[PDB]
Design a protein around this ligand. Structure first.
Ligand SMILES: Nc1ncnc2c1ncn2[C@@H]1O[C@H](COP(=O)(O)OP(=O)(O)O)[C@@H](O)[C@H]1O
Ligand SMILES: Nc1ncnc2c1ncn2[C@@H]1O[C@H](COP(=O)(O)OP(=O)(O)O)[C@@H](O)[C@H]1O
Ligand SMILES: [Mg+2]
Ligand SMILES: [Mg+2]
Ligand SMILES: [Mg+2]
Ligand SMILES: [Mg+2]
Lengths: 466, 466
């Protein structure tokens, strides 16, 4: 048999699939470096499917530190431990249990996990490649080197640094952190000269969030070109957006594409829905693939899952927004299984343990029996039909209801879940920590699923305290 | 700090106290040799309070072996692994986590745990002493040697072996297994000569239950004198029974008594209630102590908790029924904490880790603010007011209700729990796998608590399908 070590923490392939998928085929062992990062339902899936579990004991100081929260937007809690230490912890756990492989669904641990794998002679992302995938400046340089759509980009520390960039890069302009997630601090520029009395506010805002002491950024911000979208050169119907993600496996340095996902449009920069698989035509998908191939091999990644965001630009130029050496979040990975029957968690484990003896698809998965959409509603969506006032520093919610007749064609609601009756929702916090409803749709016609979603976003009834 | 390894399985100090008590003061690590022995609520308390958990992985063959039952009467499941193997497993886990101590609440693991502790140089029961406490014949010989009430006793294998015993020991006569728990096969003899066409039925019945492959019995049965009780030489009021248990800690070979428990009377040989602490007078308790001191030092036990059952015989002779080198079961250990504020789980851990530097009471705990009673109702109790027919191979239950006005004096019901509406109860199974209700009473007058219990057993309303 084979023993897989999982560094268990937030994001990526969700726990409700990951542990069962892994334990089906492997002896699963869990390391939990951040016990506070672990929801109650998460802990329960860890304990249920792992033959062994270790938590970093330094975290527990009283009995109440043994409490599991119901939900965690982000680990807003100091992890004051340098990278070399994390690596050591991982190596130690892997040796204690004779791990044949190490994976993680959490970005924060990708770098250190690569280092341990190399030291242990196990398959991994590759030490340098993981560095590249974790510093945005290094990720950019590598992409340019790899020959995918190349754009201007400067490291940014001060405002004195901000001037030289704004002047060079121009409008539209993106400035964002080198190391963080959930699009925090990621700032847009359509006005030309307010940027300054607006860079100095988002310079501070990065000093309230928390990451571990183990993610190296050689400069705090990057500035680079905003990738302009051109919806009409790509999609043939309304309902999607001008970006996509594609999911893949890297095996032995080679990129294997699995599935591309369509999106419904964002709100600000918060994502709303992921549709499995894309309706995009085969030529378009071939360009998307080709670009993710170059990007990811361009990082040097060896053995890992990938999640790559690509902006659909004019002339069908695919523009690399970002790639990570871990599974997509939300429900994308489960939905790939439901549609095609392929379990990408298992597939990656087969790669970590057996290399190209794993059964990797030859090209994107095809012959989808139907489309599955992973969708979320947010407060903004309702404020986007009036339901919320613009002074309303909070609101409380009793029910969210989907009237009948919104579904187009054979679309169908598979599941739906609303936030708890009496739920306190402060409306001066980011929306991507603020999903107040969640639904899945199935259907054999993509444009209608997509349209059915627009309709739910429009007409779903909130009942709440104004 | 200090790392305690718990071999987690059934019985003893119940999980709802043990893990929280241990984790309060120690870094707790759990080994689970029998994952099937672990209820859902148990697993959840393990994962919540342990900094590390290992399960014996050989048990998992499909995904469904990862299911936790709600309740487990007994681990009716083959554990085909010889003692030397268990020992090895325990030693390996203790080394993997640098355990400073090992404990268990489950009798089946006492012998092997002593061996590992000795090999590891950690405090324990003592290898021979644990053997003595686990083979009933060896426990008897040791008690006789120790000078506590001595009685006739022969090893029994066949019926040819049964003849020589019955003739020597006489009526009343007890014959029971050397190695099992919950009073299975424990058989009474008031008739003189039916015993034979009744020994040959209870010879077979031991071959349906299961124990691990790691408990040595050099003869399958023992026969010995039934210890006759004489209630009236001990208690001054009605309501108790003619046996007691006493709870203690062995530290460095010396017995430290903690608390004696009264009982309400049994049904068959199933226990009904445990009252913390005994109302027995100080001379009576001094005899009880003195007898448990000799018994337990007589076993040679070094470092462990003890639970010792003593029969209250005529002339105030305390008769040793049995002693185990682990905590009492049911809720006796929690109730000791509630009454006196002493946490005996912690106290034992302090002994395992620090020896007589622990804070051991000097004599039984006194100054009880009040009595707490841990009580259970069974089917028989209701069949003991008609509620069940004598053909009724099963019954289903909707509610069990305590009418008002049954409580005497300032007695009070603290908690009460009935079996689930629609619960299937086969009435050709042992009653001590069959608790269908559970209550706790508090009160400052013992005789009334005891009497309040009799009244609940009498008059509690069942509503069920006849
Ligand atoms: N350079 C860019 N050009 C266009 N859109 C971007 C750019 N960077 C970020 N975005 C938008 O914001 C989202 C978050 O970007 P990303 O850099 O992936 O931040 P995060 O790490 O928080 O996901 C992207 O999916 C994209 O829609
Ligand atoms: N030798 C005995 N004399 C009197 N009663 C006994 C004897 N052995 C067992 N019993 C009764 O049956 C119960 C179970 O006995 P024990 O030997 O402790 O079996 P178990 O290991 O199942 O608890 C005792 O608490 C006692 O009430
Ligand atoms: Mg990201
Ligand atoms: Mg991103
Ligand atoms: Mg017993
Ligand atoms: Mg007993």
């Amino acid at each position: 048999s084979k023993t897989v070590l999982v560094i268990a923490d937030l994001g990526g392939c969700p726990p409700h699939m990951f542990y069962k998928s892994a334990a089906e085929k492997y002896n699963l062992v869990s390391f939990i470096p951040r016990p506070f990062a672990i929801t109650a339902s998460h802990a329960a899936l860890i304990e249920k499917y792992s033959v062994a579990v270790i938590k970093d004991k330094d975290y527990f100081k009283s009995l109440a530190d043994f409490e599991h929260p119901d939900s965690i937007y982000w680990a807003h809690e100091d992890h004051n431990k340098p990278e070399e230490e994390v690596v050591e912890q991982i190596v130690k756990v892997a040796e204690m249990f004779g791990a044949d492989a190490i994976t993680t669904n959490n970005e924060l641990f990708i770098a250190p996990m690569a280092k341990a794998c190399e030291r242990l002679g196990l398959r991994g992302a590759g030490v340098q490649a993981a560095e590249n995938a974790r510093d945005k400046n290094k990720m950019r340089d590598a992409f340019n080197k790899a020959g995918v759509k190349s754009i201007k980009n400067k490291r940014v520390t001060t405002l004195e640094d901000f001037r030289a960039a704004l002047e060079e890069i121009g409008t539209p302009l993106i400035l964002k952190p080198t190391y963080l997630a959930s699009s925090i601090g990621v700032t847009l520029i359509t006005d030309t000269e307010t940027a300054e009395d607006e860079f100095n506010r988002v310079n501070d805002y990065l000093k309230s969030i928390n990451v571990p002491k183990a993610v190296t950024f050689e400069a705090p911000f990057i500035a680079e070109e905003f990738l302009q979208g051109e919806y009409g050169d790509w999609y043939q119907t309304e309902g999607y957006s001008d970006y996509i993600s594609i999911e893949g496996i890297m095996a032995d340095g080679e990129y294997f594409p699995i599935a591309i996902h369509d999106k419904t449009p964002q709100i600000g920069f918060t994502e709303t829905s992921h549709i499995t698989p894309s309706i995009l035509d085969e030529e378009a998908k071939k360009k998307i693939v080709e670009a993710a191939k170059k990007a990811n091999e361009g990082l040097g990644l060896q053995n890992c899952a990938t999640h790559t965001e690509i902006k659909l630009m004019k002339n069908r130029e695919p523009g690399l927004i970002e790639s990570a050496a871990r599974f997509a979040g939300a429900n994308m990975i489960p939905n790939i299984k439901k549609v095609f029957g392929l379990d990408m968690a298992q597939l990656l484990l087969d790669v970590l343990c057996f290399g190209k003896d794993a059964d990797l698809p030859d090209g994107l998965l095809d012959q989808e029996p139907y489309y599955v959409a992973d969708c979320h509603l947010y407060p903004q969506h309702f404020k986007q039909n009036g339901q919320i006032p613009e002074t309303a520093e909070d609101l409380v919610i009793e029910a969210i209801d989907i009237p009948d007749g919104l579904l187009k064609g054979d679309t169908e609601i598979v599941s739906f879940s609303a936030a708890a009756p009496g739920t306190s929702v402060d409306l001066t916090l980011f929306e991507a920590f603020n999903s107040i409803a969640a639904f899945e749709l199935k259907g054999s016609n993509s444009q209608d699923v997509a349209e059915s979603i627009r309709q739910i976003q429009q007409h779903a009834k909130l009942t709440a305290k104004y």
